[PDB]
Scaffold this active site. Sequence first.
Site, PDB file in Angstrom:
ATOM      1  N   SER A  61      42.848  43.508  48.499  1.00 52.05           N
ATOM      2  CA  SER A  61      41.799  42.554  48.169  1.00 52.05           C
ATOM      3  C   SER A  61      42.659  41.528  47.542  1.00 52.05           C
ATOM      4  O   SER A  61      41.804  40.436  47.214  1.00 52.05           O
ATOM      5  CB  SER A  61      40.734  43.233  47.285  1.00 52.05           C
ATOM      6  OG  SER A  61      39.834  43.645  48.067  1.00 52.05           O
ATOM      7  N   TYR A 147      30.100  42.447  44.620  1.00 57.08           N
ATOM      8  CA  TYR A 147      31.350  42.283  45.143  1.00 57.08           C
ATOM      9  C   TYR A 147      31.406  42.784  46.637  1.00 57.08           C
ATOM     10  O   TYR A 147      30.886  43.841  46.782  1.00 57.08           O
ATOM     11  CB  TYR A 147      32.562  42.954  44.451  1.00 57.08           C
ATOM     12  CG  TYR A 147      33.750  43.410  45.392  1.00 57.08           C
ATOM     13  CD1 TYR A 147      33.877  44.742  45.670  1.00 57.08           C
ATOM     14  CD2 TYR A 147      34.576  42.430  46.117  1.00 57.08           C
ATOM     15  CE1 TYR A 147      34.854  45.335  46.387  1.00 57.08           C
ATOM     16  CE2 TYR A 147      35.603  42.740  46.963  1.00 57.08           C
ATOM     17  CZ  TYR A 147      35.719  43.962  47.381  1.00 57.08           C
ATOM     18  OH  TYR A 147      36.599  44.517  47.999  1.00 57.08           O
ATOM     19  N   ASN A 149      33.392  42.743  50.647  1.00 56.36           N
ATOM     20  CA  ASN A 149      33.996  42.249  51.783  1.00 56.36           C
ATOM     21  C   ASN A 149      33.374  41.446  52.950  1.00 56.36           C
ATOM     22  O   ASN A 149      34.051  40.321  53.180  1.00 56.36           O
ATOM     23  CB  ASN A 149      34.930  43.174  52.398  1.00 56.36           C
ATOM     24  CG  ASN A 149      36.037  43.778  51.607  1.00 56.36           C
ATOM     25  OD1 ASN A 149      36.625  42.900  50.921  1.00 56.36           O
ATOM     26  ND2 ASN A 149      36.311  44.973  51.624  1.00 56.36           N
ATOM     27  N   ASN A 328      47.745  54.146  46.387  1.00 57.48           N
ATOM     28  CA  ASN A 328      46.448  53.281  45.629  1.00 57.48           C
ATOM     29  C   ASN A 328      45.904  54.272  44.457  1.00 57.48           C
ATOM     30  O   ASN A 328      45.014  54.971  44.445  1.00 57.48           O
ATOM     31  CB  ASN A 328      45.363  53.265  46.490  1.00 57.48           C
ATOM     32  CG  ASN A 328      43.985  52.917  45.965  1.00 57.48           C
ATOM     33  OD1 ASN A 328      43.802  52.001  45.142  1.00 57.48           O
ATOM     34  ND2 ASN A 328      43.025  53.690  46.438  1.00 57.48           N
TER      35      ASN A 328
END
EC number: 3.5.2.6
Length: 346
Positions: A61, A147, A149, A328
Amino acid sequence: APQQINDIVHRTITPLIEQQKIPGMAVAVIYQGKPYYFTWGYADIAKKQPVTQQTLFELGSVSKTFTGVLGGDAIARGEIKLSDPTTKYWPELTAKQWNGITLLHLATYTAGGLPLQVPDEVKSSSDLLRFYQNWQPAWAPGTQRLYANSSIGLFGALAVKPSGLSFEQAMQTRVFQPLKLNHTWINVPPAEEKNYAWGYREGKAVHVSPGALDAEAYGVKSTIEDMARWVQSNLKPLDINEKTLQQGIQLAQSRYWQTGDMYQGLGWEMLDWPVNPDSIIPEKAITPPTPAVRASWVHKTGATGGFGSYVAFIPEKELGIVMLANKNYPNPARVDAAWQILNALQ
């Protein structure tokens, strides 16, 4: 590197790696407009291939900062205006729920609960149109941030249209090339695969799955040198010769929306500096957007299945950091490590 940088980086990142069991990491600190580089561990565990300054990591991101700035470079060019309705750039979006939804909404995640991810089943360009046509807002556009994508993904795809270029080529010719980001890719070339780190989810080696609007939202890959350069460019936009790209960067750091203590830019997110990590870790638009505040913690986190990345910088202090990992690990841990370093060197 200055001892004071060496000192805090090694005392901070090393244990972060062991606590999170990160196979490989690269770090860059920008201090008084110079970058200093740090590398640990492996890009490819199986092959014992070490992380270097040449290693590509998935930004996830963080890609959205490129997208935002590219969108910003487009506004500066006069190609688009945040107030433009979505339907101006996609007339095929005829469903009535899009009435009054603007590029602003898309860019700031305030379109009304566009979902976190474009659903997996979307493959064709007509799949994508069907998804947006049948989507129903969960609340009024222009009132509340979620938020997403599918939100900023759409913004970036639409913002390039006036230009006649594909998003991939607008990105390369207007952002990557003028900043000499020569090892920053949406698609990694065959000869660069030897530099592309493997990400690690649950011990297995992975790479980001193709997905709709992947380029715009989460699909950039980059090296620590290029990301340091990306931070220098955002810290000191005035050094940039290309005027629209200079304004583009500046607009990306404007504040278009406040939610809690956080300010939404284009891609970049911001908090008033100083702040402590706990706050980095009231909901309304800002009209007109506040011009970029130099006393800010400007940052963005990024993840894919096998990568965790973070960038933060404080313009006032001419200070920045990039942390790239092939695993991650949790966002709080990233913001803790970074604040420790930047605060020590402030």
